[PDB]
Design a protein around this ligand. Structure first.
Ligand SMILES: CC(C)(COP(=O)(O)OP(=O)(O)OC[C@H]1O[C@@H](n2cnc3c(N)ncnc32)[C@H](O)[C@@H]1OP(=O)(O)O)[C@@H](O)C(=O)NCCC(=O)NCCS
Ligand SMILES: CC(C)(COP(=O)(O)OP(=O)(O)OC[C@H]1O[C@@H](n2cnc3c(N)ncnc32)[C@H](O)[C@@H]1OP(=O)(O)O)[C@@H](O)C(=O)NCCC(=O)NCCS
Lengths: 370, 371
């Protein structure tokens, strides 16, 4: 029984190579550290959708293309007004994508060209949705996209109401790149499971968002921040971990189905977190990292991408309930890419089985005789 | 590489046994034919969630518990008014479930009891959502659930605007029972994939609905009716079949990923389709297709599946093709909930597979200027 589908390779992919032992990550063969440093969200999105780095003009046009698609339709923006503002942002996002799906007169079209076109709209619009949610949570009005800003800069602008510093934008740009793609993780896999029935892109992405929301998965984002707050001070971190591990509970932001080593994305984020810190949250994380590490590292359990990302998002102006949506704002590129690849390379309905451990030939006992 | 995850057994389950070789189905050990004859959607639901038949008081209380959860909140009914009427019914449902979860103050509570309780709410409300969708599709107003009607009778009532005859209610009830549960099919598996991240129930069910929306899952229903229509009359059924197979094109409503024999649910539906048939045209075309296509396909292990006869049953109950999959969801939500409860109980592990990597490694980041 392949519990958790661990070790099950169900398809072939060119998109993401994860070396869990050595802790390497590549997007179509390019190391993530290279991309985080040098690339942008648009460029990495092109890479993930097209399978190669864009040329100058391609990138310029691809970015303008995405930018032109950032705005949400009035209908959806009107709908947001009654979206329960106390609802979790991932549930906001989940609903927005589904509703957006209804507004598409050709929603069901899944030709490669339509997936790509609808995907460009989702990749572009996700930031606008999450930002709108954030503005609404704050009792303020959603802000229209500024097409002149990069995706990252625009996301910050719509979320915060002011154009970000170039540094702030670069930080957001780095974070998006780091979360953009990561193989057949739970949310990507869920999207493919859904898509494997030839359902529409919105259905597959709603499912992906649904999946990403979980605290075992992308929800570990805010969970780690919850952990930091619960700890409160770096002075309480060690004993906190000691007793957390003593009651055999899990330390959020550590451990990974694949990485049995420091997450190469966490490695990058740790450095960005360190720069923002220069700081209690970061100090607390380092202590948790050290203290939990000494029992978990030997088990192959290390900080993952969710461990340091919150420090980063928090610096960018986001409260913790938006950490996972920010994740989604990036990962949508990877989801669309995977849906395009799965269609091309495999496109088979996923229909697994289980090991039945129940009973057979149980009688239907007459009601009055039970 | 395990394409399609075929033969991949990723968890243990007690809920559903699918005998693919002999064409047998059981919900917690009970043959599907028994439940289709004797049980009810509420009782079978109880079975699917509790793993056993309910005592008389239990069922009565359970039925009532579901009945008082049928009504949708005014907030959601109001939102429906702006849902695009031209939208796909499954997109309506997908959105409805998602928006409903937003109205739940403890949406993310996934303790067993909270899953059970929220699952009952979804089971009860799925019929009310799909029925509202249908009313709205017709430019009409949703109809409030009636507690004095069973789940099936009420569904027809809310959907059609008139209380169904006992016969029609019995047909629907039997149809819901038959589609309530079927192992780790795409929608159920996708529910689990989602839920394995410990996301909320609505997220998992929204994902289930997203999967079910696909034509490769729960769809054939419509395709069979299209087939029947393109055949037109039983007089040209055999010929159509012979030509269809010669085109090496598939015959809708036959063949199954697991069933390499007659679908036991098709076995029950075949008798029910014949009941509604006694417009016998639909049915007669189907029996001729079954026979002519079966003489060729049966030996290859392909037989009619649940989708072969269900369409005839649903359109007779007043549902257009596009509501076939929603009606499927109205029943399967019981199994989805049951599976989420079981998965949590028995396994509860993150679903995180891998892929065989056939890409490049150590690709340099070439400068923009040099590309
Ligand atoms: C991601 C995660 C689900 C991967 O786990 P998995 O591959 O599905 O494996 P399992 O959950 O079955 O666990 C393996 C063992 O490691 C332990 N373990 C896993 N991650 C752990 C963590 N973060 N804290 C402490 N113990 C942990 C488990 O308790 C388990 O114990 P056992 O064999 O002693 O019973 C898991 O590491 C986790 O829950 N991490 C916290 C959430 C998180 O940060 N998720 C984001 C991943 S990027
Ligand atoms: C469910 C389904 C996908 C299973 O396909 P499968 O796993 O490839 O089926 P088998 O493994 O038993 O197939 C062996 C052969 O029978 C053919 N076959 C099976 N389904 C067929 C159908 N309904 N009509 C004609 N031929 C069919 C296959 O195409 C295959 O091709 P080959 O001679 O080229 O190798 C297929 O039966 C189908 O598309 N059904 C029609 C629609 C339908 O009713 N399905 C929905 C409910 S599951």
């Amino acid at each position: 029984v392949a519990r958790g589908l661990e070790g099950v390779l169900f398809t072939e992919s060119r998109m993401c190579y994860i070396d869990g032992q050595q802790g390497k990550l590549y997007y179509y063969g390019i190391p993530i550290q290279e991309l985080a440093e040098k690339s942008s969200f648009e460029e990495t999105t092109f890479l993930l959708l097209h399978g190669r780095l864009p040329r100058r003009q391609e990138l310029e046009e691809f970015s303008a293309a995405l930018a032109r698609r950032r705005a949400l339709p009035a209908h959806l923006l009107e709908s947001f007004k009654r979206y329960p503002v106390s609802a979790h942002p991932m549930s906001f996002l989940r609903t927005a994508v589904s509703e957006f799906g209804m507004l598409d007169p050709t929603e069901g079209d899944i030709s490669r060209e339509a997936l790509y076109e609808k995907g460009l709209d989702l990749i572009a619009k996700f930031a606008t949705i999450v930002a709108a949610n954030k503005r609404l949570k704050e009792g303020k009005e959603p802000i229209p996209p500024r097409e002149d800003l990069s995706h990252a800069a625009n996301f910050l602008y719509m979320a915060n109401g002011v154009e970000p510093s170039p540094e702030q934008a670069r930080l957001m740009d780095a974070a998006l790149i780091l979360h953009a793609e990561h193989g057949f993780n739970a949310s990507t896999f869920t999207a493919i499971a859904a898509f494997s029935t030839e359902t529409d892109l919105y259905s597959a992405i709603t499912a992906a968002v649904a999946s990403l929301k979980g605290p075992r998965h992308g929800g570990a984002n805010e969970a780690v921040m919850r952990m930091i707050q619960e700890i409160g001070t770096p002075e309480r971190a060690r004993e906190w971990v000691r007793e957390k591990l003593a009651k055999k509970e899990r330390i959020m932001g550590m451990g990974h189905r694949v990485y049995k080593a420091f997450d190469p994305r966490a490695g990058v984020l740790e450095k960005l977190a360190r720069l923002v810190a220069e700081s209690k949250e970061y100090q607390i994380l380092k202590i948790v990292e050290e203290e939990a590490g000494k029992v978990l590292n030997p088990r192959g359990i290390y900080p993952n991408v969710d461990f340091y990302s919150g420090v980063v998002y928090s610096d960018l102006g986001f409260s913790l309930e938006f950490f996972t949506p920010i994740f989604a704002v990036a990962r949508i590129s990877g989801w669309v890419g995977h849906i395009l690849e799965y269609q091309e390379l495999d496109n088979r309905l996923l229909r697994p089985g289980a090991k039945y451990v129940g009973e057979l030939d149980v009688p239907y006992v007459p009601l009055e005789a039970r």
